[PDB]
Amino acid sequence: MTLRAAVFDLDGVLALPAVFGVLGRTEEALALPRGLLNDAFQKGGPEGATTRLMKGEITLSQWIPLMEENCRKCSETAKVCLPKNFSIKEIFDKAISARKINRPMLQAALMLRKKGFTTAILTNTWLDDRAERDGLAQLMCELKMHFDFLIESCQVGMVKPEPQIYKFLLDTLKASPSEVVFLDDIGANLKPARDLGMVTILVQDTDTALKELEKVTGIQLLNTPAPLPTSCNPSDMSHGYVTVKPRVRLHFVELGSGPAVCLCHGFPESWYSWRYQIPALAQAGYRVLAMDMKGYGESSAPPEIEEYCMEVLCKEMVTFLDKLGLSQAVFIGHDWGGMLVWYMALFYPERVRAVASLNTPFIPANPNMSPLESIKANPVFDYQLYFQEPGVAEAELEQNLSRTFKSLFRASDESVLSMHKVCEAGGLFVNSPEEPSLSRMVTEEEIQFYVQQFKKSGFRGPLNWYRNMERNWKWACKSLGRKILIPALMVTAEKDFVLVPQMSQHMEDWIPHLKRGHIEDCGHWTQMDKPTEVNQILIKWLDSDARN
Numbered sequence: 001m002t003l004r005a006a007v008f009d010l011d012g013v014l015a016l017p018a019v020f021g022v023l024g025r026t027e028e029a030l031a032l033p034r035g036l037l038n039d040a041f042q043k044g045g046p047e048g049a050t051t052r053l054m055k056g057e058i059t060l061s062q063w064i065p066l067m068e069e070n071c072r073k074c075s076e077t078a079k080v081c082l083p084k085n086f087s088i089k090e091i092f093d094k095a096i097s098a099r100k101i102n103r104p105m106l107q108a109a110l111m112l113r114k115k116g117f118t119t120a121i122l123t124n125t126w127l128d129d130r131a132e133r134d135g136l137a138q139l140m141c142e143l144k145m146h147f148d149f150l151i152e153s154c155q156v157g158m159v160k161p162e163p164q165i166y167k168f169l170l171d172t173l174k175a176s177p178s179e180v181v182f183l184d185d186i187g188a189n190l191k192p193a194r195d196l197g198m199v200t201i202l203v204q205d206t207d208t209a210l211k212e213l214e215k216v217t218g219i220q221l222l223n224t225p226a227p228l229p230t231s232c233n234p235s236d237m238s239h240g241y242v243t244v245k246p247r248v249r250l251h252f253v254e255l256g257s258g259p260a261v262c263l264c265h266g267f268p269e270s271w272y273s274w275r276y277q278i279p280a281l282a283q284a285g286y287r288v289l290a291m292d293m294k295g296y297g298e299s300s301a302p303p304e305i306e307e308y309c310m311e312v313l314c315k316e317m318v319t320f321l322d323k324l325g326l327s328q329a330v331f332i333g334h335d336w337g338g339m340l341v342w343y344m345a346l347f348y349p350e351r352v353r354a355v356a357s358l359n360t361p362f363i364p365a366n367p368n369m370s371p372l373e374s375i376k377a378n379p380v381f382d383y384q385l386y387f388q389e390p391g392v393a394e395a396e397l398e399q400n401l402s403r404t405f406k407s408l409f410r411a412s413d414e415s416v417l418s419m420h421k422v423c424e425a426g427g428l429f430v431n432s433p434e435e436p437s438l439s440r441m442v443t444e445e446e447i448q449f450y451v452q453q454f455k456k457s458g459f460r461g462p463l464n465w466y467r468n469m470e471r472n473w474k475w476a477c478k479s480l481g482r483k484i485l486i487p488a489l490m491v492t493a494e495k496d497f498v499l500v501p502q503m504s505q506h507m508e509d510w511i512p513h514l515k516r517g518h519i520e521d522c523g524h525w526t527q528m529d530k531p532t533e534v535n536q537i538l539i540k541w542l543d544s545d546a547r548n
């Protein structure tokens with residue numbers, strides 16, 4: 001009775017415009033008899049060429065000659081002559097290419113799966129061996145990840161509306177007819193489903209079909225707020241391991257193809273902090289490499305403090321590129337990662353295609369002042385003095401991992417921390433709740449991932465990034481006569497009460513062609529506070545500065 005599974009057609013529902021609709025306009029353009037392309041498309045019926053193509057018996061390249069004869073045969077009966085420029089190859093090439101994803105439909109499908117539905121795609125498709133088959137391959141891959149099953153006609157040897165495929169569909173979904181809703185742009189494909197007892201929605205226009213699907217499922221799909229970008233499931237990611245040197249191996253996650261983009265997280269985060277950026281960046285045509293920085297998660301965490309100074313952390317990232325075969329890579333960082341990528345561009349510009357930083361500005365070294373004096377001359381950086389002593393800051397953060405991350409990963413309007421009274425009060429969480437409320441930015445599952453990551457190597461490694469003030473300062477002073485002249489981007493967050501946008505006001509002195517981005521109502525955790533704006537800024541900057 002109560003629905004539980006949802007099935008979606010591709011051509012006409014999830015993808016628009018349908019191939020039949022582009023074939024109809026072609027009939028109008030070249031002034032053919034109406035429907036002639038569709039009579040040739042459907043010549044022979046269940047024993048014709050198109051059904052042999054839809055069943056995997058022949059490939060698309062094999063079917064085009066058969067479609068050419070059907071058009072010459074159909075044009076002979078209607079007493080007409082096909083133009084001199086008639087090309088079925090070129091006609092379908094434009095149709096397959098013009099087909100885009102119906103985002104209101106896919107977003108509604110995601111909402112159902114989020115609410116606990118089993119989503120699937122049931123489409124009549126073909127084995128595409130065209131030279132331009134990659135265009136259709138990209139489309140399928142980005143739709144496949146959002147559904148539990150993709151049942152293709154040419155893979156199973158069954159086509160709609162043959163009843164055998166619907167019995168195969170119900171077996172795949174492991175559900176009864178009256179528990180499944182099925183959407184298709186063709187009414188013929190619904191009669192066998194409507195006979196087995198499943199709910200049917202004829203999709204003519206998307207917003208009306210969504211109104212019907214709202215009613216039968218009891219879930220609001222239309223006029224739903226803007227959904228978050230696609231997140232990452234760790235157990236479905238490609239996990240990579242590179243040994244940059246003895247006792248030091250770096251763990252990273254990889255997705256997509258194209259120019260290598262290397263993401264560097266901050267303190268106290270993980271590769272998972274790019275969960276909203278990784279698919280979005282890979283979809284834009286990039287090979288994302290989200291790192292576990294030295295001392296974090298599955299990466300090595302040697303205890304020595306000097307192993308985390310900026311000079312060592314940068315030489316190892318260069319090595320990481322070497323052992324992977326990458327001459328360059330776009331470096332996007334946040335918090336400590338952002339500071340590391342600034343010095344990557346300053347010391348190894350030949351290995352940085354482009355550099356970008358979230359929140360963290362490039363503050364050049366002061367040759368006449370130690371960094372400890374400057375940190376003391378700023379009450380917001382007072383927690384960094386508390387971090388200096390080893391073991392002290394570790395005991396507090398490692399005491400209750402759940403409370404630690406729930407008190408940190410909070411929006412700008414949820415803050416329960418006072419970064420300016422840390423050393424005085426003798427702790428970061430002295431005046432914070434023992435069981436803080438779950439922020440709007442992170443679910444309980446996402447918090448429990450960070451907990452499991454930091455159960456590995458603790459907080460010693462991460463905190464050691466703070467404990468190389470004098471070493472990093474001596475190193476940076478060697479680059480005081482340089483200038484960053486590669487593509488650079490500085491993204492500032494309005495409500496970051498520690499890395500304020502005003503700290504970046506002088507950066508153009510050192511980066512003349514610096515580009516900028518600003519995100520409003522955004523706290524420190526830029527990636528998970530405003531992921532849709534982070535994705536927009538980066539994909540726009542990458543497409544114009546990093547790619548060729």
Ligand SMILES: COc1cc2c(cc1OC)[C@H]1Cc3ccc(NC(=O)NCc4ccc(OC(F)(F)F)cc4)cc3CN1CC2
Nearest residue numbers: 267335336363364365366371374375408417419498499524
């Ligand atoms: C050469 O002059 C400097 C040089 C340098 C530094 C300062 C300098 O003076 C100009 C400081 C600056 C700095 C600032 C922030 C961070 N980020 C960070 O610690 N993030 C963790 C975190 C953030 C917010 C939190 O609170 C809440 F969660 F939002 F609530 C809790 C934790 C890093 C650095 C790097 N430093 C050394 C270099």
Ligand SMILES: [Mg+2]
Nearest residue numbers: 009011012185
């Ligand atoms: Mg269709």
